[PDB]
Amino acid sequence: VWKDADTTLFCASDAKAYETEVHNVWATHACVPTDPNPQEIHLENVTENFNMWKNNMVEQMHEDIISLWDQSLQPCVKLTGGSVIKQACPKISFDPIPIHYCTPAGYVILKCNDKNFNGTGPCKNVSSVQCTHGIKPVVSTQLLLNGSLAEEEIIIRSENLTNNAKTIIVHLNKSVEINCTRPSDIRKAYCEINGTKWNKVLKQVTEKLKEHFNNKTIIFQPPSGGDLEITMHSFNCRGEFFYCNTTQLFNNTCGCNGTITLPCKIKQIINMWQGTGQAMYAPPIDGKINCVSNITGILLTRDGGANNTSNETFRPGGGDMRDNWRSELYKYKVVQIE
Numbered sequence: 001v002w003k004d005a006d007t008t009l010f011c012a013s014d015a016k017a018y019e020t021e022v023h024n025v026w027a028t029h030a031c032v033p034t035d036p037n038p039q040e041i042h043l044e045n046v047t048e049n050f051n052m053w054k055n056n057m058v059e060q061m062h063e064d065i066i067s068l069w070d071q072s073l074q075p076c077v078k079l080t081g082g083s084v085i086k087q088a089c090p091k092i093s094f095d096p097i098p099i100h101y102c103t104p105a106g107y108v109i110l111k112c113n114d115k116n117f118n119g120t121g122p123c124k125n126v127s128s129v130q131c132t133h134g135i136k137p138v139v140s141t142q143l144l145l146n147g148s149l150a151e152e153e154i155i156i157r158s159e160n161l162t163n164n165a166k167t168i169i170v171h172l173n174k175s176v177e178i179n180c181t182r183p184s185d186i187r188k189a190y191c192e193i194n195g196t197k198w199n200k201v202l203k204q205v206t207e208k209l210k211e212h213f214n215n216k217t218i219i220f221q222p223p224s225g226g227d228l229e230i231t232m233h234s235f236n237c238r239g240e241f242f243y244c245n246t247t248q249l250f251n252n253t254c255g256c257n258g259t260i261t262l263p264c265k266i267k268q269i270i271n272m273w274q275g276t277g278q279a280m281y282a283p284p285i286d287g288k289i290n291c292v293s294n295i296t297g298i299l300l301t302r303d304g305g306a307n308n309t310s311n312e313t314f315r316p317g318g319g320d321m322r323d324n325w326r327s328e329l330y331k332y333k334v335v336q337i338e
């Protein structure tokens, strides 16, 4: 028998002791080795209530990735609270590895196994684990990359679908590849996407949004302002910060069924996701830079004033990295064995 409780977690990883890669190096000194023989125990006659939007596991993983990034990414110049920090800025090797989050003695992790569980409310197929599965701390906006997929249906996850400032997390069941490259202006980059698969999955998601918003007309629109970090789909590829224009995906047109080519730029000055200010890095490395990533989720914000209007308007959201961890941690919760 158990009780809801918060506790300090510890991380586990398949990290290589001989790697120079920064994620491996952080987990070699901050995490344990993954359990060589994990045990999931299904708990019968048991229904449990979950809530991904009030889950302390998210804020603890957030804390970890903050610290991994400040130990691994060394910008030339940091501009925080008036201070201006000059540093060394060698190029690093960057490629995230899965992290597992594990309870200490006396506590345990309950797992929701309902395939169409939306994130809040009851779960009747519940298991028990000592560690979560392997989660990749991928930092990005608009699109959630290299994550896990919904088992059955596309799932809409939000704290309050009526609050328009409450972000929406769309969990796909079919991943779409995005192939982003800077070949051998050295900051010009691009991304290739199957419009065939994108527009079909996009149409499937607007069907899902009709269910939650009284059959109304779903309209996709580009971000209506902000810094480049949220107006573009931004991510780190091998240590370089990419900024990609995604208006061709957030578009209601679809003569369009081939490959979509998104324009991208590698930026050296960025607004940090940790909130601490600005940072400037060094020019990108020699040679072809290439990352192929799975799109497994979308982040969205709904427009306002349409209380009386016939349609609903959704634009690609992002910015708060806590929602990125929420999208992989939603099915877990820590409880104290009483």
Ligand SMILES: CNCc1ccc2c(c1)C[C@H](CNC(=N)N)[C@H]2NC(=O)C(=O)Nc1ccc(Cl)c(F)c1
Pocket (backbone or CB within 6 Å): 139, 140, 141, 229, 230, 234, 235, 236, 241, 242, 270, 271, 272, 273, 274, 275, 276, 277, 318, 319, 320, 321
């Ligand atoms: C409704 N949303 C609220 C909202 C909106 C925008 C933002 C926050 C919250 C937080 C954060 C504030 N910090 C700041 N303004 N300097 C700011 N996020 C970021 O700057 C950010 O993610 N950058 C970033 C860096 C690198 C990569 Cl690869 C990347 F993919 C993204």
Ligand SMILES: *[C@@H]1O[C@H](CO)[C@@H](O)[C@H](O)[C@H]1NC(C)=O
Pocket (backbone or CB within 6 Å): 113, 114, 125
């Ligand atoms: C509970 O979840 C498991 C794992 O996903 C799956 O086999 C099935 O949906 C459920 N099985 C039982 C016995 O409850």
Ligand SMILES: *[C@@H]1O[C@H](CO)[C@@H](O)[C@H](O)[C@H]1NC(C)=O
Pocket (backbone or CB within 6 Å): 118, 119, 120, 121, 122, 156, 157, 158, 161
């Ligand atoms: C999720 O399901 C619960 C009931 O299990 C319901 O109260 C809530 O409105 C649902 N939210 C969404 C976004 O579907």
Ligand SMILES: *[C@@H]1O[C@H](CO)[C@@H](O)[C@H](O)[C@H]1NC(C)=O
Pocket (backbone or CB within 6 Å): 146, 147, 174, 175, 294
């Ligand atoms: C991408 O998705 C496919 C299937 O959806 C899977 O086989 C592959 O391992 C995924 N890659 C990553 C990095 O998640």
Ligand SMILES: *[C@@H]1O[C@H](CO)[C@@H](O)[C@H](O)[C@H]1NC(C)=O
Pocket (backbone or CB within 6 Å): 152, 153, 154, 173, 174, 204, 208
């Ligand atoms: C994903 O879920 C949607 C329901 O929104 C469904 O129509 C679609 O067929 C599913 N795709 C797969 C591959 O199961």
Ligand SMILES: *[C@@H]1O[C@H](CO)[C@@H](O)[C@H](O)[C@H]1NC(C)=O
Pocket (backbone or CB within 6 Å): 160, 161, 162, 163
């Ligand atoms: C969702 O937000 C609306 C708008 O403020 C609010 O009136 C409503 O109470 C919220 N829904 C819930 C279930 O709290």
Ligand SMILES: *[C@@H]1O[C@H](CO)[C@@H](O)[C@H](O)[C@H]1NC(C)=O
Pocket (backbone or CB within 6 Å): 179, 181, 192, 292
């Ligand atoms: C990614 O794009 C590059 C350049 O367009 C190409 O050489 C490579 O084969 C692509 N990879 C995949 C998996 O499509």
Ligand SMILES: *[C@@H]1O[C@H](CO)[C@@H](O)[C@H](O)[C@H]1NC(C)=O
Pocket (backbone or CB within 6 Å): 214, 215
């Ligand atoms: C929404 O539209 C579908 C169309 O298949 C219909 O079956 C359903 O009853 C409608 N719901 C509402 C609330 O109008």
Ligand SMILES: *[C@@H]1O[C@H](CO)[C@@H](O)[C@H](O)[C@H]1NC(C)=O
Pocket (backbone or CB within 6 Å): 231, 232, 245, 246, 247
């Ligand atoms: C993205 O491209 C469109 C034209 O396709 C352009 O109007 C828009 O300004 C671009 N996005 C940003 C953030 O500049």
Ligand SMILES: *[C@@H]1O[C@H](CO)[C@@H](O)[C@H](O)[C@H]1NC(C)=O
Pocket (backbone or CB within 6 Å): 194, 196, 197, 258, 259
């Ligand atoms: C888009 O996906 C389909 C799979 O349904 C694949 O056959 C096709 O090659 C992809 N697009 C391109 C341009 O190759």
Ligand SMILES: *[C@@H]1O[C@H](CO)[C@@H](O)[C@H](O)[C@H]1NC(C)=O
Pocket (backbone or CB within 6 Å): 095, 096, 138, 145, 146, 235, 236, 237, 238, 291, 292, 293, 294
């Ligand atoms: C997704 O995974 C592949 C292989 O694991 C990797 O090359 C790519 O860089 C990842 N995507 C991002 C955005 O890091």
